[PDB]
Amino acid sequence: EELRRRIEELERRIR
Amino acid sequence: EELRRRIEELERRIR
Amino acid sequence: EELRRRIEELERRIR
């Protein structure tokens, strides 16, 4: 969950 | 693999 | 650590 949520937040901003 | 591939796709776009 | 550090480097650039 920890790293998944951080990836998900980056994806909203970039993709 | 799941999270690795998503990081790899973000890296292509940013770095 | 591997994937964490890569996420951390992306976060510095985006957020």
Coordinates of N, CA, C and O in Angstrom, one line a residue:
Chain A
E1 N 0.8 -1.2 0.0 CA 0.0 0.0 0.0 C 0.8 1.3 0.0 O 0.5 2.2 -0.7
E2 N 1.8 1.4 0.9 CA 2.6 2.6 1.0 C 3.2 3.1 -0.4 O 3.0 4.2 -0.8
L3 N 4.0 2.2 -1.0 CA 4.5 2.6 -2.3 C 3.5 2.6 -3.4 O 3.6 3.5 -4.3
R4 N 2.5 1.8 -3.3 CA 1.4 1.8 -4.3 C 0.7 3.2 -4.3 O 0.5 3.8 -5.4
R5 N 0.4 3.7 -3.2 CA -0.4 5.0 -3.1 C 0.5 6.1 -3.7 O 0.0 7.0 -4.4
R6 N 1.8 6.1 -3.4 CA 2.7 7.1 -3.9 C 2.8 7.0 -5.4 O 2.9 8.1 -6.1
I7 N 2.9 5.8 -6.0 CA 2.9 5.7 -7.4 C 1.6 6.2 -8.0 O 1.6 7.0 -9.0
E8 N 0.5 5.9 -7.4 CA -0.8 6.4 -7.8 C -1.0 7.9 -7.8 O -1.6 8.5 -8.7
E9 N -0.4 8.5 -6.8 CA -0.4 10.0 -6.8 C 0.5 10.6 -7.9 O 0.0 11.5 -8.6
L10 N 1.6 10.0 -8.2 CA 2.5 10.4 -9.3 C 1.8 10.2 -10.6 O 1.8 11.1 -11.5
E11 N 1.1 9.1 -10.8 CA 0.4 8.8 -12.0 C -0.7 9.8 -12.3 O -0.9 10.2 -13.5
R12 N -1.5 10.3 -11.3 CA -2.5 11.3 -11.5 C -1.9 12.6 -12.1 O -2.4 13.2 -12.9
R13 N -0.7 13.0 -11.6 CA 0.0 14.2 -12.1 C 0.6 14.1 -13.4 O 0.4 15.0 -14.3
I14 N 1.1 12.9 -13.8 CA 1.9 12.7 -15.1 C 1.1 12.1 -16.2 O 1.3 12.5 -17.4
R15 N 0.3 11.1 -15.9 CA -0.5 10.4 -17.0 C -2.0 10.6 -16.9 O -2.6 10.3 -17.9
Chain B
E1 N 6.8 -7.0 -10.1 CA 6.6 -6.6 -11.4 C 5.6 -5.5 -11.6 O 5.8 -4.5 -12.3
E2 N 4.4 -5.6 -11.0 CA 3.3 -4.7 -11.1 C 3.8 -3.2 -10.9 O 3.6 -2.3 -11.7
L3 N 4.3 -3.0 -9.7 CA 4.7 -1.6 -9.3 C 6.0 -1.3 -10.0 O 6.1 -0.1 -10.4
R4 N 6.9 -2.2 -10.3 CA 8.1 -1.9 -11.1 C 7.8 -1.4 -12.4 O 8.3 -0.3 -12.8
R5 N 6.9 -2.0 -13.2 CA 6.5 -1.6 -14.5 C 5.9 -0.2 -14.5 O 6.2 0.6 -15.4
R6 N 5.1 0.1 -13.5 CA 4.5 1.4 -13.4 C 5.5 2.5 -13.1 O 5.4 3.6 -13.7
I7 N 6.5 2.2 -12.2 CA 7.6 3.2 -12.0 C 8.4 3.4 -13.3 O 8.7 4.5 -13.7
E8 N 8.7 2.3 -14.0 CA 9.4 2.4 -15.3 C 8.7 3.2 -16.3 O 9.4 4.0 -17.1
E9 N 7.4 3.2 -16.4 CA 6.6 4.0 -17.3 C 6.7 5.5 -16.9 O 6.9 6.3 -17.8
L10 N 6.6 5.8 -15.6 CA 6.8 7.1 -15.1 C 8.2 7.7 -15.4 O 8.4 8.8 -15.8
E11 N 9.2 6.8 -15.2 CA 10.6 7.3 -15.5 C 10.8 7.6 -16.9 O 11.6 8.6 -17.2
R12 N 10.3 6.9 -17.9 CA 10.4 7.2 -19.3 C 9.8 8.6 -19.5 O 10.4 9.4 -20.3
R13 N 8.7 9.0 -18.9 CA 8.1 10.3 -19.1 C 8.8 11.5 -18.4 O 9.0 12.5 -19.0
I14 N 9.4 11.2 -17.2 CA 10.0 12.3 -16.4 C 11.5 12.4 -16.6 O 12.1 13.5 -16.5
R15 N 12.2 11.3 -16.6 CA 13.7 11.3 -16.6 C 14.3 10.8 -17.9 O 15.5 11.1 -18.1
Chain C
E1 N 13.8 -1.0 -0.7 CA 14.7 0.1 -1.0 C 14.8 0.4 -2.5 O 14.8 1.6 -2.9
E2 N 15.0 -0.5 -3.4 CA 15.2 -0.3 -4.8 C 14.1 0.6 -5.4 O 14.3 1.6 -6.0
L3 N 12.8 0.1 -5.3 CA 11.7 0.8 -5.8 C 11.4 2.0 -5.0 O 11.0 3.1 -5.6
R4 N 11.6 2.0 -3.7 CA 11.4 3.2 -2.9 C 12.3 4.4 -3.3 O 11.7 5.5 -3.5
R5 N 13.5 4.1 -3.6 CA 14.5 5.2 -3.9 C 14.0 5.8 -5.3 O 14.1 7.0 -5.5
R6 N 13.6 4.9 -6.2 CA 13.2 5.4 -7.5 C 11.9 6.2 -7.4 O 11.8 7.3 -8.1
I7 N 11.0 5.9 -6.6 CA 9.8 6.7 -6.3 C 10.2 8.0 -5.7 O 9.7 9.1 -6.2
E8 N 11.1 8.0 -4.7 CA 11.6 9.2 -4.1 C 12.2 10.2 -5.1 O 12.1 11.4 -4.9
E9 N 13.0 9.7 -6.1 CA 13.6 10.5 -7.1 C 12.5 11.1 -8.0 O 12.6 12.3 -8.3
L10 N 11.5 10.4 -8.4 CA 10.4 10.9 -9.2 C 9.7 12.0 -8.4 O 9.3 13.0 -8.9
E11 N 9.4 11.8 -7.1 CA 8.7 12.7 -6.3 C 9.4 14.1 -6.2 O 8.8 15.1 -6.2
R12 N 10.7 14.1 -6.0 CA 11.5 15.3 -6.0 C 11.3 16.1 -7.3 O 11.2 17.3 -7.2
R13 N 11.2 15.4 -8.4 CA 11.0 16.1 -9.7 C 9.6 16.6 -10.0 O 9.4 17.7 -10.4
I14 N 8.5 15.9 -9.5 CA 7.1 16.2 -9.7 C 6.4 16.9 -8.6 O 5.6 17.8 -8.9
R15 N 6.7 16.6 -7.4 CA 5.9 17.2 -6.3 C 6.8 18.0 -5.3 O 6.2 18.8 -4.6

